[PDB]
Design an enzyme around this catalytic site. Structure first.
Site, short mmCIF file in Angstrom:
data_model
loop_
_atom_site.label_atom_id
_atom_site.label_comp_id
_atom_site.label_asym_id
_atom_site.label_seq_id
_atom_site.Cartn_x
_atom_site.Cartn_y
_atom_site.Cartn_z
N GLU A 44 24.71 65.77 -6.60
CA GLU A 44 25.12 65.85 -7.86
C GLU A 44 26.56 66.12 -7.74
O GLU A 44 27.67 65.95 -8.35
CB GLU A 44 24.40 66.29 -8.68
CG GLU A 44 25.18 66.48 -10.48
CD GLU A 44 24.51 66.91 -11.06
OE1 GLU A 44 25.97 67.87 -11.43
OE2 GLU A 44 23.65 67.22 -11.79
N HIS A 45 26.86 66.88 -6.58
CA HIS A 45 27.78 67.62 -6.32
C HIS A 45 28.90 67.47 -5.53
O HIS A 45 30.65 67.01 -5.91
CB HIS A 45 28.22 69.38 -5.68
CG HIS A 45 27.77 70.42 -6.61
ND1 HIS A 45 28.36 71.62 -7.07
CD2 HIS A 45 26.78 70.50 -7.54
CE1 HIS A 45 28.23 71.99 -7.34
NE2 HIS A 45 26.72 71.65 -7.76
N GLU A 49 27.87 79.02 -8.72
CA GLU A 49 26.52 78.10 -10.57
C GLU A 49 25.31 78.87 -10.39
O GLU A 49 24.90 78.79 -11.60
CB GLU A 49 26.58 77.01 -10.11
CG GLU A 49 28.18 76.40 -9.78
CD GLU A 49 27.64 75.00 -10.29
OE1 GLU A 49 27.33 74.25 -10.07
OE2 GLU A 49 29.08 74.19 -11.08
#
Ligand code: HEM
Ligand code: HEM
Ligand SMILES: CCCCCCCCO[C@@H]1O[C@H](CO)[C@@H](O)[C@H](O)[C@H]1O
Lengths: 49, 101, 421, 55, 443, 220, 54
Positions: free
Chosen positions: E59-60, E136
């Site tokens: 997703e990154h 994160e």
């Protein structure tokens, strides 16, 4: 971080019917409880007697 | 005919709470509704009620009453709390009614 | 029948009524008003904030209890949004309940009783409300920004100052509503309703006489600088200049310069290449940061500049780098293609803004309030792209040349002063 | 005042603070059982004692 | 124009399937703007001990460029057209979607396909994101609410796949290989397990066409077009307690196993949750709120906030509540909370469900407020129910619910069950499991 | 000292140089009274230009000398007095630091009259900058200044502080005569100059209270 | 606690019911019978035991 946390393994303690991680535990729930509650109800009977 | 006025004025004097300098409203039993109403009284009306009561309790303990000239007069008795109290009871009944509905 | 009209009457007393039927199963009515902390003076500061929270108190027609129970009874909602200069009271609910929900919206905005006790009880909430809002550093520096930018009106904070919590009175709330909630300063906008219907409700129930009530003082620019040294690892800073006011060909210029400089991210975790400002700051520092083109348009004024967020030690370079990107832009450093792209992002943004009921209703009402009319989404697009590259470069100049006001919070140990920019 | 009677009531409050919500060490052994046994002997002796006293 | 009528007049959702197995669905409106994206049936649940957090790692990179167009190029192109590119990865579902002018629906579809099929997985970009993801994880570690829900899954589904967090382990993030991510993408981002959904002013036939053009690469074998059924995750009544009296407030989450997407009972559980509702210190309503629990919270200052939830999954789910409170009001809050749950199974009223049903209707209507949310509904519906479910159907189902039905369903999933408990922060006042377990009966 | 003081030598970490800013901070807190101070970079400790300000200070008004009495020998007070009817207070503010100093006036007034009171204080400074300073004024001020200094050392705390302060910033001790000698040897010119440095220099202001009528530094 | 009358678990009780106990300033003689009843009880018990012993 919390991501690195996992519940340990309780196999040495789990009741036979909830030992397998890939099986719904709900199917043996009424038996697991019925049994325990049976013991309790019986103790109440003896006690009432 | 003005029969009430005759009666209500008689009772008022018969009751005698005015001999302590208390208003009719000062003598109400503080149930739930009254308690709420008191919380709505304006600062001054509240502090005035307090003095009258503290003073009456003082009279009560001394076993005296006020000199006849200070007794509250039937027509000068202020129903300072009745307006609030009425609103309070109305509101409560509304909630009660609505909670059955 | 998705080809309905966007009617918009305007009764004699000046009350504007704009509606629209999109046949959505949900209706969303609102009462727009020209009110806010802007109309407060030293004596009644925060009264507009409290008035916002006072929405659920008892009115002449409904009790505090019934307002809440009533609306909830039909899965409805009631909220109140507000800016320094406008207040909106809106309710949402399924179509078949617009009648029910309406009674309350009405009572709230036109028949408040501001009972002393209920008001006294509510005031401590101002601390709580303010406390949660201030968790975003953003909100704190924007307050100080307006206090450095102006000397009056718009300088007033959007959240009740601390020394006044518990001091606002019922008189003050009544007087505020009487002198600001006037038929000629209000607009009854609605969605998922029929104009004939909404129109009828207005003329029949909305009372509180016309007039412009007390008019607000003119916004005087100051160009101050407020620095809140609070030790946080991150430093928030905003530098602005007096920009265009609502309704201006000058406005559009800044809107575009905004998107040309960098108005928010478009890709998740992605870099903003189409962002002159971001890209410029990026080249200067290695650490995490954030820069954006700030832009506000008010009735009689506006503010324009850039807002940054950076590590304390690199606040210096990050803020200076943002400045160069503005000078550079003022000196023709603006491609003609840049202006094209920005015009897309601007047209897109505006167009997406109206996807949600809240966004649409707010678009309609805002305009239907500041000019009882409604620009076609084409005329607005027509007005926007018809903005030359010249215009933009000019806007950029007005900034580098105008007097600036700054506000910064955090460990300001390395944050530069306005006179070192 | 309190959402549950077990804590507000002037009598239950007492039963609750000494026999229900009373904080106890997690590791007390069987040697900590005699206190309650003693209390039960007491009540038991009293009961049988009155019964005997009546004759 | 009545509620009923408006529900019937809503444009239908069109679905068509390509030969490769991919499904294309879309709901048409008259909006110059639109949202289109690909909803993939993938997530952490499909990962395992070695590749946990790969779907997140992906997703990154899904936005850092493809083969046909490197980073800068990919970004500039998307930015320069005023389109928004977002996405997310959960335990059982992932999604990459774009917001833009209907006028570009086709260019977008090409962009999407390029993202899900030809991710560059730049060896250097991977090491760069490895450090970002690690930052994160430390940021999210301060999100008590999310730390609490992770723990709730960690214990409620201990020993199974749903026990893992979406972001993954520190070890995994530090050792995932370019090859692993590659493998992930290939193994999971496959036509039959994806859905091209779009909403706004778009031609279903024009959408499906651009779809045929870019979403191709059909499969040869049978193992490539079959959607793998995941092994069941065992629910366990238990608790995990992370104590830190240094934290200002405590978070608590209690839950019982839920049915799973396909089960009709979910309509009732949602009505049930609607009765209890939710609350937070900024609800003007205050002491007059309909939700009993909320009212008590206000009167006795039981918490800063609380919320109910019915988190569904393919074969299981989590039905419970979560609250935040001061160390000294945890016990009363838990008491009142479990109390309300008992009231549900035992004494729900017609008035109660009436209100809750209305609240629930406007809730479902609110989840279709914009192109993205509607597009999200479609992706999810086909992916979970294998078909779109109209507001009119929901409403049909919601309308059938009555008090008795609520009591029966709630009694079924709640009454006398062993819950899953997660408590974080200053939790000394929260009583033991046994006491909580007893709050599960009589009420 | 020598037999016990051990933490040793050096000049330790030296302090950064004082950089002037000339900012303006306004604390709106609603109080009935408004306190405001307007200053300009003044003289440093030892700076010859020191005494000049000290005198200009006493010439303008450096605190009351008569209980409940008015200060006639106070240019600043008298000037403000003529402007407002309500209770107030105005004084010449003056601070001398190692590498800098501040000079100006401090006022206190009702909120509504804060405007006129502050503006009135300003005029008294301009007027003084424009030779509006008698040669007798400078004589009187030099008395009050010599007196004040002399009284300051009556109490043990004041004496010890006098000795120590100087014995710290220059390991010496000026005779109470040399100090007096230095003070009165200050021309009326000097004073008028100090007054000018103020009206011309960049100013910094700070005010608290109900600042609804308090003027901004750029309206002075 | 600075004074035993308030800290001690037993005295605390005597203090909260017979020393620092807040009482209305105006209660009359009709409020005396409560304590008299208490004394009758203690008295009856005392004499009762003495009688029971014979
Ligand atoms: C701490 C509680 C008590 C203890 C330790 C206790 C102990 C004893 C003992 C050692 C005996 C003699 C038993 C025997 O005959 O060999 C006795 C007798 C007796 N006790 Fe108790 N007793 C207790 C309480 C009471 C109470 C409360 C009563 C009556 C209200 C009572 C009434 C009697 C009577 C009537 C006898 C005589 C009849 C008999 O000896 O069986 N006792 N008790
Ligand atoms: C509430 C307290 C008490 C009351 C109301 C009470 C009342 C009485 C009454 C009405 C009598 C009869 C007196 C008569 O002969 O005319 C009596 C007898 C007796 N009471 Fe009590 N009594 C109390 C407490 C006690 C206690 C605690 C004991 C012993 C532990 C006790 C032991 C006796 C005895 C032994 C007699 C019989 C001898 C006699 O009649 O004089 N009493 N009591
Ligand atoms: C010594 C005289 C006692 C008379 C009986 C009064 C009852 O009972 C109450 O219980 C509380 C908790 O233990 C105490 O703190 C109070 O002081 C006590 O009055």
């Amino acid at each position: 971080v919390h991501n690195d946390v996992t519940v340990p393994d309780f196999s040495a303690y789990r009741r036979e019917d909830v030992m397998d991680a890939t099986t719904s535990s709900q199917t043996s729930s009424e038996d697991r409880k019925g049994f325990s509650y049976l013991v309790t109800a019986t103790a109440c009977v003896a006690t009432a007697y | 005919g003005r029969l009430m006025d005759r009666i209500r004025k008689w009772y008022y004097n018969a009751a005698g709470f005015n001999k302590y300098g208390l208003m009719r409203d000062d003598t109400l039993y503080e149930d739930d509704d009254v308690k709420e109403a008191l919380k709505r009284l304006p600062e001054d009306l509240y502090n005035e009620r307090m003095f009258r009561i503290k003073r009456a309790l003082d009279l009560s303990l001394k076993h005296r009453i006020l000199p006849k000239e200070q007794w509250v007069k039937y027509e000068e008795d202020k129903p300072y709390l009745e307006p609030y109290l009425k609103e309070v009871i109305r509101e409560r009944l509304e909630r009660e009614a609505w909670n059955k509905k | 029948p998705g080809a309905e009209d966007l009617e918009i009457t305007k009764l004699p007393n000046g009350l504007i009524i704009a509606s629209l039927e999109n046949f959505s199963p949900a209706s969303r009515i609102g009462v727009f008003i020209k009110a806010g902390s802007r109309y407060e003076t030293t004596a009644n500061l925060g009264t507009a904030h409290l008035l916002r929270l006072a929405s659920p108190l008892t009115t002449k027609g409904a009790s505090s209890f019934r307002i809440t129970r009533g609306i909830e009874a039909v899965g409805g909602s009631l909220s109140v949004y507000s800016t320094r200069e406008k207040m909106t009271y809106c309710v949402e609910c399924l179509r078949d309940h617009v009648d029910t929900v309406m009674e309350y919206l009405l009572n709230v905005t036109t028949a408040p009783e501001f009972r002393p006790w209920e008001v006294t009880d509510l005031q401590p909430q101002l601390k709580v409300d303010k406390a949660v809002a201030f968790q975003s550093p953003q909100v704190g520096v924007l307050e100080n920004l307006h206090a450095a930018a102006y000397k009056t009106a718009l300088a007033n904070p959007l959240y009740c100052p601390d020394y006044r919590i518990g001091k606002i009175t019922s008189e003050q709330l009544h007087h505020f509503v009487q002198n600001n909630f006037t038929s000629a300063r209000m607009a009854l906008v609605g969605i998922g309703v029929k104009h004939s219907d909404l129109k009828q409700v207005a003329e029949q129930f909305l009372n509180i006489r016309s007039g412009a009530g007390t008019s607000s003082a003119k916004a005087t620019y100051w160009g101050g600088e407020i620095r809140e040294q609070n030790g946080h690892s991150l430093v928030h800073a905003a530098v602005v200049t007096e920009g265009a006011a609502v309704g201006s060909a000058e406005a559009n210029a800044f809107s575009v310069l905004q998107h040309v400089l960098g108005a928010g991210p478009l890709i998740k975790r992605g870099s903003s290449v189409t962002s002159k400002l971001y890209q410029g700051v990026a080249k200067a520092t290695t650490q995490p940061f954030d820069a954006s083109a700030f832009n506000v348009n008010y009735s009689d004024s506006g503010l324009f500049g850039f807002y940054t967020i950076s590590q304390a030690a690199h606040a210096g370079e990050v803020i200076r780098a943002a400045m160069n990107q503005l000078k550079a832009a003022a000196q023709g450093g603006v491609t003609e293609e840049d202006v094209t792209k920005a015009k897309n992002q601007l047209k897109a943004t505006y167009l997406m803004s109206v996807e949600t009921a809240q966004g649409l209703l707010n678009e309609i009402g805002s305009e239907a309030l500041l000019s009882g009319t409604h620009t076609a989404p084409s005329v607005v697009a027509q007005k926007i792209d018809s903005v030359t590259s010249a215009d933009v470069v000019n806007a950029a100049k007005k900034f580098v040349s105008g007097k600036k006001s700054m506000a910064a919070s955090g460990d300001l140990g390395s944050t530069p002063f306005l006179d070192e920019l | 005042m309190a959402p549950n009677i077990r804590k507000s009531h002037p009598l239950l409050k007492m039963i609750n603070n000494s026999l229900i919500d009373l904080p106890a060490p997690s590791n007390i052994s069987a040697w900590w059982n005699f206190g309650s046994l003693l209390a039960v002997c007491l009540m038991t002796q009293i009961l049988t004692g009155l019964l005997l006293a009546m004759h | 124009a009545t509620y009923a009528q408006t529900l019937q007049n809503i444009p239908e959702t069109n679905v068509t399937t390509l030969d490769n197995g991919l499904r294309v669905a879309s709901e048409e409106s008259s909006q110059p703007t639109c949202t289109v994206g690909v909803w993939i049936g993938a997530g952490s649940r499909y990962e395992n001990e070695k590749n946990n957090g790969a779907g997140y790692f992906v997703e990154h990179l899904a936005f850092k460029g493809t083969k046909k167009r490197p980073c800068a190029a990919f970004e500039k192109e998307v930015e320069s057209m005023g389109a928004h590119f977002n996405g997310y990865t959960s335990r059982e579902q992932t999604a990459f979607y774009i917001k833009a002018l209907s006028k570009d629906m086709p260019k977008v579809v090409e962009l999407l396909a390029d993202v899900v099929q030809n991710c560059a997985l730049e060896e250097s970009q991977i090491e760069k994101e490895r450090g970002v993801i690690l930052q994160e994880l430390k940021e999210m570690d301060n999100d008590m609410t999310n730390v609490t829900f992770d723990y709730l899954h960690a214990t409620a589904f201990q020993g199974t796949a749903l026990a893992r967090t979406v972001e993954g382990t520190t070890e995994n993030i530090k050792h995932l290989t370019r090859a692993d991510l590659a493998s992930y993408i290939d193994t999971h981002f496959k036509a039959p397990r994806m859905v091209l959904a779009a909403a706004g002013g778009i031609s279903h036939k024009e959408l499906v066409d651009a779809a045929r053009q870019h979403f191709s690469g059909v499969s040869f074998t049978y193992k490539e077009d079959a959607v793998p059924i995941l092994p069941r995750c065992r629910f366990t009544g238990s608790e995990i307690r992370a104590r830190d009296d240094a934290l200002p407030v405590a978070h608590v989450a209690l839950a019982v196993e839920g049915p799973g997407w396909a089960d009709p009972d979910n309509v009732v559980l949602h009505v049930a949750n609607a009765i209890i509702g939710r609350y937070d210190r900024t609800f003007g309503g205050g002491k007059h709120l309909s939700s009993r629990l909320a009212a008590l919270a206000v009167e006795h200052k039981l918490c800063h906030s609380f919320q109910t939830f019915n988190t569904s999954y393919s074969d299981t789910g989590l039905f419970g509540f979560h609250f935040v409170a001061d160390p000294l009001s945890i016990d009363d809050m838990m008491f009142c909370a479990q109390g309300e749950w008992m009231r549900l199974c035992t004494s729900t009223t017609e008035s109660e469900v009436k209100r809750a049903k209305n609240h629930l209707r406007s809730a479902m209507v609110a989840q279709l407020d914009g192109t993205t949310p509607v597009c999200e509904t479609i992706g999810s519906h086909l992916l979970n129910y294998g078909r779109r479910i109209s507001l009119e159907e929901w409403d049909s189902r919601i309308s059938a619910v009555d008090a008795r039905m609520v009591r029966d369903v709630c009694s079924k999933y709640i009454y006398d069950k062993c819950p899953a408990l997660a408590a974080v922060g200053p939790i000394e006042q929260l009583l033991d499991y046994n006491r909580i377990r007893s709050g599960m009966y009589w009420i």
